[PDB]
Design a protein around this ligand. Structure first.
Ligand SMILES: [Zn+2]
Ligand SMILES: [Zn+2]
Ligand SMILES: [Zn+2]
Length: 178
């Protein structure tokens, strides 16, 4: 197995996947690495299994249809993985914890949002549809863009949103377009 966490790229107290060579810190994995379970399969393996069991799940889909799906176990898992994929980018540190807003010439957002809050919301099964999760994720970046205005720091929002969106299209097999 790997000697660093797949998500944060640091060594430490790591749990090793039994079906692939990835390793994770306990709370870097999403969901948090389970207490017992031998063997244990990580979320990358669990997502691969879903695909292999239903090859047709990779045919293209309309985003509108994906968003209206109820958060049954497989959609819950796919959102957990998509959230993990954003945490895998080091620039996610900017959006992880609860932000605050005091900048001359700007006003804070009406509805602040951050990755740790989405993580808790998923853990507590607060989303009933994929739409709920996707709206919160997109809100994180939209709030950032609106607040930082013409400061070049706005680009961090664009960058992390692109990681989100690419992984969203991949995981939920959105129909490719120009
Ligand atoms: Zn880690
Ligand atoms: Zn694995
Ligand atoms: Zn089938």
């Amino acid at each position: 197995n790997s000697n660093i966490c797949e998500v944060c790229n640091k060594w430490g107290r790591l749990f090793c996947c039994d079906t692939c060579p990835r390793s994770f810190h306990e709370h870097c994995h999403i969901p948090s690495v389970e207490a017992n379970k031998n063997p244990w399969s990580c979320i990358f393996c669990r997502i691969k299994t879903i695909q292999e069991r239903c090859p047709e799940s990779q045919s293209g889909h309309q985003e509108s249809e994906v968003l209206m799906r109820q958060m049954l176990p497989e959609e819950q898992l796919k959102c957990e993985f998509l959230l993990l994929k954003v945490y895998c980018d080091s620039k996610s540190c900017f959006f992880a914890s609860e932000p605050y807003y005091n900048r001359e010439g700007s006003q804070g957002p009406q509805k602040p949002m951050w990755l740790n809050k989405v993580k808790t919301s998923l853990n507590e099964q607060m989303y009933t549809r994929v739409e709920g999760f996707v709206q919160d994720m997109r809100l994180i970046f939209h709030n950032h863009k609106e607040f930082y205005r013409e400061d070049k720091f706005t680009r961090l929002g664009i960058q992390v949103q692109d990681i989100f969106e690419k992984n969203f299209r991949n995981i939920f097999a959105i129909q490719e377009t120009s």
